[PDB]
Amino acid sequence: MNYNNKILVSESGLSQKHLIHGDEELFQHELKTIFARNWLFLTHDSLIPAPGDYVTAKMGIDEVIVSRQNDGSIRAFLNVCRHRGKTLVSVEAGNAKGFVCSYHGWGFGSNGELQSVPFEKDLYGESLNKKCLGLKEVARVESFHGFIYGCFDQEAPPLMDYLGDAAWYLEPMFKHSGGLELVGPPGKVVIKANWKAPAENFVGDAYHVGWTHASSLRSGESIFSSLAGNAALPPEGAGLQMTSKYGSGMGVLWDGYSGVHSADLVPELMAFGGAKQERLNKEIGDVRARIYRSHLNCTVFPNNSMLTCSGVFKVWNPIDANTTEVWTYAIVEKDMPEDLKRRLADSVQRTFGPAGFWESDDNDNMETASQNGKKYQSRDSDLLSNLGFGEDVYGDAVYPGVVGKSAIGETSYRGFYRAYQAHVSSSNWAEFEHASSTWHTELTKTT
Amino acid sequence: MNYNNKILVSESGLSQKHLIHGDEELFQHELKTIFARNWLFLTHDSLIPAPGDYVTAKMGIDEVIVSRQNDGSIRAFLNVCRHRGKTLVSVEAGNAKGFVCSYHGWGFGSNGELQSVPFEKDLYGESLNKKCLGLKEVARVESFHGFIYGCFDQEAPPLMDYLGDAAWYLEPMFKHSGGLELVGPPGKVVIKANWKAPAENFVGDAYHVGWTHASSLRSGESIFSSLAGNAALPPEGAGLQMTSKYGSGMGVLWDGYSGVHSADLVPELMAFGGAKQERLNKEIGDVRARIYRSHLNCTVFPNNSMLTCSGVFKVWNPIDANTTEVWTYAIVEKDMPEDLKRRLADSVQRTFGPAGFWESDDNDNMETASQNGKKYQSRDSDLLSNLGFGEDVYGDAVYPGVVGKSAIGETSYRGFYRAYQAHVSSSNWAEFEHASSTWHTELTKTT
Amino acid sequence: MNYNNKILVSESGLSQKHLIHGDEELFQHELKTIFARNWLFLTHDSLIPAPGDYVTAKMGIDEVIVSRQNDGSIRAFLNVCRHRGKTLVSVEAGNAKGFVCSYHGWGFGSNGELQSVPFEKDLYGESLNKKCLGLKEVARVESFHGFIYGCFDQEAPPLMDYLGDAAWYLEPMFKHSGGLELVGPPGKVVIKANWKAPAENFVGDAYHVGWTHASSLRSGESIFSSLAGNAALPPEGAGLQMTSKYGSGMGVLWDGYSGVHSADLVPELMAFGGAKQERLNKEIGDVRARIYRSHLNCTVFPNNSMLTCSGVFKVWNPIDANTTEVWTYAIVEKDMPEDLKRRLADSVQRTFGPAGFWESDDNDNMETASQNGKKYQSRDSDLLSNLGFGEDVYGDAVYPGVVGKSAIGETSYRGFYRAYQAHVSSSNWAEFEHASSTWHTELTKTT
Amino acid sequence: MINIQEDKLVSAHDAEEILRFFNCHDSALQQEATTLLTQEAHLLDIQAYRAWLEHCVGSEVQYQVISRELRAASERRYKLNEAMNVYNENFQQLKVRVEHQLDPQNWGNSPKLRFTRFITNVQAAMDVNDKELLHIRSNVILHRARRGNQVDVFYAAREDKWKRGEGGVRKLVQRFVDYPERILQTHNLMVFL
Amino acid sequence: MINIQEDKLVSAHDAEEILRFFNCHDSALQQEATTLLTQEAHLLDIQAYRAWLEHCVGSEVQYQVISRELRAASERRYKLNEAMNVYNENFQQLKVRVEHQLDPQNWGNSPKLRFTRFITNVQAAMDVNDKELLHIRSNVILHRARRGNQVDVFYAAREDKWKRGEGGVRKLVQRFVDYPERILQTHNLMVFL
Amino acid sequence: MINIQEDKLVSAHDAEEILRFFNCHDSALQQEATTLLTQEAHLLDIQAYRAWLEHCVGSEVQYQVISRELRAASERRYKLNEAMNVYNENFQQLKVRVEHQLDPQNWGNSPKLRFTRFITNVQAAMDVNDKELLHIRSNVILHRARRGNQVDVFYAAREDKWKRGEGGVRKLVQRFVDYPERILQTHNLMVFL
Ligand SMILES: c1ccc2[nH]ccc2c1
Ligand SMILES: c1ccc2[nH]ccc2c1
Ligand SMILES: c1ccc2[nH]ccc2c1
Ligand code: FES
Ligand code: FES
Ligand code: FES
Ligand SMILES: [Fe+3]
Ligand SMILES: [Fe+3]
Ligand SMILES: [Fe+3]
């Protein structure tokens, strides 16, 4: 396939070829144009707070070691020995001053440097240029309020710029709340779906909630429960949708601070969020203080998703076109009482973790939609994302980005796939920029 | 590989490159030129007799819903939602007026039409053109005496024409007997063989019976049992072989009405078939009345096979070059007493079903022959199908098609592979026709 | 990838692209340019000593029958029926005058000839040219002191010439000791590594022993045990490394006759080897008599490895880029007492067989190094094999081949990969020869 | 205990079998049933099929394994054949299958197959009406290995009736299995569950 | 017996559990525990989830399955959360999960799933302090099949505490499982181990 | 019962073992053997390898696992070595393997492996000649998980001899396993069956 010319995503992001969820050649091409190019979630300060702390993470199909340096910075390196290529670190987290390879014993520092080679003097003499043999380093590592992202491409925009208009919506909870912590370790499960299926669902699919999650809404005892079995549609301006230049987007469900949590947490959460909102009104204004305690379903392009307030944090780690390894953490506000933090983390896993009953409702939807992308008569068929098209706006006085002022729609799918087409048809960041010089006009056409 | 030029099957169908059973690129090419082009078995009237009855079936690697319409016709549709591509129906059979998608709740009628969209007015307003959003429909659906076939290609010949000369042989049992019913549900098993291996074996391999099935013949207590371990060769004109323009073919074993059934059914069957034959003599003549109660091993190109009289009915559903999902039903004559129908169906499964002891004898033959097609030194080797070449005739006064007047030979392999080459090297039905304008001359050369 | 031009291995074999352990297209290309071209281990005289004895073996991904002929020679044939391609022989060893196919009963002799066809006269008449239907024969089969190798390419050098300079080192143990026997049956295990990972480790990796095998050295009770955890480095000239034109190479560890065997065998072995060495001094000279009782870790290119003295004999049978089927036999000196032979064979399996505790230490190293070759950021990275470069010699007065006069280094990796590049970039043996006309100069550069 | 109007996922058949074991527990009977099944499994594992027929199988046996078509949980109109019989054998039919296994021209049996059976969750209860009959439920994991790298694992629950027989030789008069996998991924179901 | 300073790979928790069963063996108790677990597994296998809650689960239950992060065997500095809870349920939380299973709009339950559980290695010991409580250890292989060709097999050891209850109806008051696979390859862990 | 001239697929060895268990059944012995094997499996599962050696393994032990070459069922001429020993260990050799497992430089043991064993089909019979010896047969499913996504499952039948020992501490004097899979698909067989 010629990705310079092939229309995988139609103008304005209105539809996508179904093969995108199943084609292995495209998956390989995404490794280059999506995963090697864009910002990918690694870890949180809370998981590697002290010098020497490290974790392993995936970046696309590659594995990296993410390490807290002595000076307080974080550096990340491919988890691959520079000698004969053995995987250096076989654990998920720890604290160490360096990493020794189990094959020939080469020792690398937490800073990636080749620090020792067994019997170096006797064997290599002075011939080994250890300075040129440091671990392959992730070019860019940046933080968004403690959430650490990496990018293999030194030409990428800064992380804050890459978040674009989505950052404004995240800041009330990520910054003004006093900050969040990530509670590990994550759940880890493999699903037989393409990574884009859950990423698109979290970035902008409120339509599925009432029907897909009918059983979880009814038995679950949660605040959004009136939607079970499409018994009811959300109110007036019960929410909105947004998307951004670099593909990140989210839904906003006003005031839904207890999120997916069962009735056993609803009163406590609604009290806590409302109390903080009252303080935030004076600091960031009423609209942003309300956004803080509003449920955001968002995807940070390409493959990191979250539900704020519910506290669900996901990484959709790609394995092949129909295999994804799902990592699930909980996010909690740092100033919540410890006991509430613990209960909230368990509730996140209860609902969206490996035995998450809500997450279970989505399995078949994501796996069959993905696998159908391999079937001959469906490869060239069109997945539709036109709901709300011609009603989105750009440049609103209050809510930034391309915004659909309704709780349910497909605005965010269109922005995600727009950005996706622009990357898959581009060889570098400059070309992506050229292809995106009118990103918001393309998304608001007909309005 | 250039399939316009590559000789996969030699002139007259005398040999085939072994890679045809193992090459994945060719398998993908068959999805287009074999499975998307030709008539594929779906179901029987007996399985969906009433309005609203439906089943799911495979057509190649695609899955379809096959539904009895209110007007008594049958329509079939891809089992894929027109919104985001989720599999619509997760069961094998049922009765319903429509199908609702578990993702966002879109509801399609049994006629494929998009009939409802949750909250359509509030969400889409009048923007949704539901008339253009019906399920993707199988272009052609036709019946042969109750046996329902589908074809994705609107340019295909009518099913009766596609059966060509094979139809004459099937009609005594399929039509003149009063009709057949298919007894479901089928057995379903995956084998590690190419779909062509069992299809070629059923279309024209009587040679293997005595040797491959030695143990089943000896322990089985059946009418063809004198062949065990090649202890004996069939008589004079104990049978014949035939093939046709579009690839269908069969063997005929005169008078073998009890087929593979153990001695526990032999007397009852031989009595029943002989009694009906006596009535048929006056209606269709002695030769065709005898064909009715003669054992036919036939493949309806590409991947539907059967043993009449034994009552075995198979679909070799392709999964990849070395994986096939085998569906096994029983066929019974509608006017047989119910208790005989039940015993016959159990006997079909006993011998050729998931624990079929005869079918078990063929496993290793079909799986290793297929897997050997991937091995480097065998890819370009030649599978032989020359037995009987130069003794086949065209246009006989009594038995139509290209016919080998002997019970054991490879006439039907040659016709199957001829048709196969013509399709794989053609882009459409017109080209297949051009490539087949001398089909019978090619098959009878040297005679 | 264009293998005429792609630099997979840098000049002098100093580095290799990591993708060589993971690329499936290259694996397919190796089937042609490595496995179909070179000498591959089949069996030993000791396993098929009498007329009619046979075994099955792999040659690349193909399977062959290796049979002792009535005249005492050995012939090998593809294990594939010439009719419809079924696997002929389903066992690993036996004695027979021929092989009958379980599909249609064709019978082939131990000499490969098609000897019988069921009902030939009645079915084929005189039309079957059985003389042209013998099993596909392995073009070349030769013996090195009882060890039988096959080659599909009739243009290959004789086996002795192919061993090149490595033969000199093997002869003391393979010839002058009175000869070896192979003790079967082999252990058989699948590992998720590329075949080159264990082949490179056995051809010239002494560096890993102390670190990788730390636990086996310490608990094992063996002669090389002072190396555990890199507690100590071998002495002066404790050994050397060598490599050859056609890729075979080995390490030599002076006097290490008990090898990996635990202390329970050390005294008996050291006595036996020393006694034979004393006799050999007069026959082949002191240096070669010492080589006889010195531990050789060698790979006979491409995929046969051994540890002499330890008695480990391996075949790394390729399945795909990250799958190898490991066959492990024991080699013993024919004149050792029977009870010692038995204990030695058990010890070989104890240490390097399916539950070999030493072999277990290498698993993760070989599997992760291989699998990392598929990871996007590592495909184009460079595996290093520069240890000892610029200190190797050609044409030494005592030790032939390209030789590194030190126990630990990467001389043999460089010769193995040199030969590998030359084959992968060549279409035939003549081109390999042209590409190898300065093989030793390339390897000794900078010295 | 079970009320299938409340326990919505439970079939009437399954609820009837719960009732049979939850009442009247006889520890000695449970142990006897365990022994009996362990010995049967040993005979099958070593491929002593004639001995299994002679020592373990009653003349009146029905040996049945069904494959049930996948239907909607809410289905109430479609009433056609719900299942097919992978096995539905009387003694003579079992004997035919045993002769097929033992025939020296059963090419698929060379090299010799390897079977290993794991029997668990044994429950036993006497029939209320026929005092010659014992109801035994058990689950089985059956591992079949052949030809180097072929491995198939089967999983099932078995509902058996065994008769006392004579001389303490208990014999199977009914085995019923509703096979849990609709599409088999074991090449065939040519094994005695 | 166990000394974890010598048996370097053994955790303190695991050594404590060995000690509890190796001392004071009561064969009758072992058999009672086997019966109890077999009946529990039967109720779960037929998806009688309400009956399981009513007959087998105590009001004070803690039903916990953890996933432990992979750490170096020699790790001694990193002290953050070692595990997460796949399950950590009280009775009400179990009831929510049971209602979710029984809801007619639980689309993933149509067609009906098939479960088969294999319980082995049963050990039982009375609690030293609370004579209402029995410690039962057992291992379980759980096979889940659905939708034609989906098959997931789970493997685990269970550390349970069961209370005597009333009328001989023993009820689970704690189940603890440390799930052995860190990355699940069964689509989810939506099964009651 | 078994006649191997009639039961054509049965080996002489296998027929001899049937005979040993079908005669003289002692229910108490079966239960004792079950307890013993369950405790052994628990020690192995928690990787208490030193405790296993000390508490469960006799000084005179032969611990043997063979891999038999695939030969034609009709083969009668080829008489070379039929099998090889994956294990054939005396006590000292087992001790070497245990030290290898416990060594802190056994890099493959970090992160810590997880083992779960399922022992079934237990049969026991006293030796006819040596009254210190008990013959115990059992089958085992062994699940080994490591490093996130590596899972290997082993299946085997075990033919053991255990001696009474002293103080009621029974010890293994012989374990024999004929491994059913000829080509292993578990990376290695580095587990104690
Ligand atoms: C609430 C709203 C939108 C959502 N997208 C995915 C889960 C989810 C929950
Ligand atoms: C009888 C005759 C021909 C046949 N082809 C396949 C099965 C079969 C049975
Ligand atoms: C000793 C020396 C070199 C070696 N290479 C592989 C095993 C081995 C043992
Ligand atoms: S591969 Fe890491 S030190 Fe050699
Ligand atoms: S995918 Fe079917 S309604 Fe959305
Ligand atoms: S395939 Fe061997 S005789 Fe036909
Ligand atoms: Fe959802
Ligand atoms: Fe057949
Ligand atoms: Fe090694």
PDB file of N, CA, C and O and ligand atoms in Angstrom, chain B residues 201 208 212-213 362, ligand 8:
ATOM      1  N   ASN B 201     -10.072 -34.589  -2.226  1.00  0.00           N
ATOM      2  CA  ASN B 201     -10.257 -35.975  -1.828  1.00  0.00           C
ATOM      3  C   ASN B 201     -11.700 -36.384  -2.069  1.00  0.00           C
ATOM      4  O   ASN B 201     -11.955 -37.470  -2.619  1.00  0.00           O
ATOM      5  N   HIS B 208      -7.834 -43.859  -2.607  1.00  0.00           N
ATOM      6  CA  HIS B 208      -7.356 -43.926  -1.212  1.00  0.00           C
ATOM      7  C   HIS B 208      -8.193 -44.804  -0.323  1.00  0.00           C
ATOM      8  O   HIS B 208      -7.730 -45.192   0.739  1.00  0.00           O
ATOM      9  N   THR B 212      -6.198 -45.982   3.006  1.00  0.00           N
ATOM     10  CA  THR B 212      -6.442 -45.038   4.097  1.00  0.00           C
ATOM     11  C   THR B 212      -7.469 -45.556   5.078  1.00  0.00           C
ATOM     12  O   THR B 212      -7.284 -45.449   6.314  1.00  0.00           O
ATOM     13  N   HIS B 213      -8.568 -46.104   4.568  1.00  0.00           N
ATOM     14  CA  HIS B 213      -9.676 -46.521   5.424  1.00  0.00           C
ATOM     15  C   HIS B 213      -9.693 -47.997   5.758  1.00  0.00           C
ATOM     16  O   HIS B 213     -10.708 -48.488   6.227  1.00  0.00           O
ATOM     17  N   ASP B 362      -8.328 -39.941   7.594  1.00  0.00           N
ATOM     18  CA  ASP B 362      -7.866 -38.993   6.571  1.00  0.00           C
ATOM     19  C   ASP B 362      -7.047 -37.853   7.157  1.00  0.00           C
ATOM     20  O   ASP B 362      -6.378 -37.166   6.385  1.00  0.00           O
TER      21      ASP B 362
HETATM   22 FE    FE G   8     -11.068 -40.677   3.175  1.00  0.00          FE
END
